[PDB]
Amino acid sequence: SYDIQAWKKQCEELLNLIFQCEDSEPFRQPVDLLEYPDYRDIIDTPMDFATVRETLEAGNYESPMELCKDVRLIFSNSKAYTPSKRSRIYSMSLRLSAFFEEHISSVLSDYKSALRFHKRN
Template sequence: MQEVMRQFGTILKNIVKKPMDFSTIRKQMDANVYKNVREIYADVRLVFTNAMTYNDDDKSDIHVMARTLLERFEEKWLQLIHKVVDAEERQKDEEAQALTTMQSAQEAAIAKLARDTNNELNQLNLHLGELRELVIQSCRKMTTEEKRKLSSGIASLCPEYLFKALEIIAQENPNFQDATEEVDIDIDAQNEITLWRLKFFVKGALENQARNSVTKPKNQAKEADDVMKRKKLIYDALAKTARKRSRKPSP
């Protein structure tokens, strides 16, 4: 008997590619497997078409009954289809509204975050400004000898570090021109915080240059030529500043 049932099942699978019955449909409905009504409609229709396929004699009672029930089912479906379409449209509208609401909430959250971040940055800039003023007030005056060493150190910088040193000067002096052919650097005109920033920067830059000079080849003619040009520029600027100071009348 078991062998007969097994063979029957094999024959059924060969004829009916996707079995379906009302009990399975009910279980899937209870388990919320179906995403929409159209999927239920497709499975109900599959029950009838499977019965017609398995009983392919169109004059047999089962075939005739399955076809009749399918026709009545299709008539009922046509009566319900407009309600299904309306429900689908409402679902789309609700999903679109929910998406719009979610996007609006996200945009509002991003805008709030941007405002909060901007306020925090403004507060930070305010504190940095106060701290900067405090640092300026606490900086001791740089001696004449320290200024002389600083000028010499700037003149010894390679082009890369020299441009960075000029940027430090320009940050505190908006009118400072570092792109002209002749740069006028007046060490005495710089405020104390600029002088100390330059001192620390030049010290580290010269140390890096000393380390790099050990590993780099000595025959880099172009780089050496650039260094000499930039050094001459600095020397000329320092000399010009010195001449200006020497022409000032003594008090």
């Protein structure tokens, strides 16, 4: 399964699954500051799933590793902004992270394999 380009549609499909998860709703658009006035005092680099999908569709990811770094920033931002590890929204982030990691592992493996096969000679 040595298609170097296959990761892109596999990531589009996984983002569609994430958008169907009720657990994604807080992460689907950039945070608003009128409701969370201290956000940018805590979080240096905001990230959300609409920004990830737009970056993919623009052709501005070169690999699934880059997409994975931005998705993991969504989750690290939630863990750093949360006032409690028992937060509703943080709790939603941890379920969504487990789902994402379960599904991204084969996408990363297949891409890295494809690149090694390309450079086999």
